[PDB]
Subunit: 116 residues, 4 copies
């Protein structure tokens, strides 16, 4: 799994479940092309977005739909989404975990990058 | 000053100085229009971006050029930039501070929304 | 003012007001001696803790009563308090700001160390 | 495993390996009694600290030896350690993950608490 996303809820001390995630890849015309999407599981994790073959070098954007998460719980949060933008695979294939820690008016995001 | 941006460096324990910041407002055609920009000061702060009269309700994006900041320090970073996307809401008087705390492979952002 | 403490609330997007803060200095017998204390202001800040003359090199602990803060808001928290432990080092002129960003089940703390 | 500790390095975008962790439990005389200890693995995780039987209700302190981690890499960091203090098991047995995200002048800590 070369790309995994993990989301935690800092209010509840729990995984953030059923969070929508959209991944985009910058195209030759400098527009964001849809690449993959999915929803976090009961563990707060989203696996199976892509494959080593498909996950070529490029500039990627991981959009985490934080507003929809908080609104579904009755909280009116500050941000629309959390966006994570990065170059991937430019020194060869790596495995990326993009983690996010959510609060209604704050979030954190960390990348853990390993060479398989 | 309804909108201020503050950037901190978690590696050095210091304000993040001379960081480029760009603000965009979403236009009716769903594109991001340049709105304001500047560079953080010696205190890590960027004031003077906008006025009460100009800062109307709408969806804004604050882009913080993190990659350039790390490169100037000789440090290899993960993200292309940090992006903060939010709706400005009139609800009695409100000042917005968008704070960011930067590490090479992680950042946090918090909105501090106050009434003078 | 060589030592300032600043506390932010990531749930409400606000300064954390009226938070008790206690500072201790490690004594020769390896016990924590009360040093300074106070409550954060309407801006989330606590100034006036110490002076240049009193704040000598040594190991300090800043204890932030987070649990009481959450309880006053009717919110159930995880931590008993947040603790920040560090050595103060004379190395030319230095001011220390200990910042904390609070959520019920998570906190961050950052040291911003500057020269006037 | 009712208590697990996970540490990440925000500079490198990697698990924090070989980080020493000491756990204490508050005793009847209000002193911190040693409870368990260990070092993070190559995954940044520390498993096997305790058992359901031994991990009774109480106030626990998890001390993460962050200074020794950074110094072993040639970085002179700000904090002595990161301390996480919390009541555990007071509504019955839970599983606790204490995560920490480290930078030289900043850290974050989150608890994920699940009911088995």
């Amino acid at each position: 799994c070369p790309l995994m996303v993990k989301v935690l809820d800092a209010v509840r001390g729990s995984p953030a479940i059923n969070v929508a995630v959209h991944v985009f890849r910058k195209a030759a015309d400098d527009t964001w092309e849809p690449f993959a999407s999915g929803k976090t599981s009961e563990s707060g994790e989203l696996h199976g977005l892509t494959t080593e073959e498909e996950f070529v070098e490029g500039i990627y954007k991981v959009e985490i739909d934080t507003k929809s998460y908080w609104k579904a719980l009755g909280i009116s949060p500050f941000h629309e989404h959390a966006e994570v933008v990065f170059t991937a695979n430019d020194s060869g294939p790596r495995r990326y975990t993009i983690a996010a820690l959510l609060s209604p008016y704050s979030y954190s995001t960390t990348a853990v990058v390993t060479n398989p």
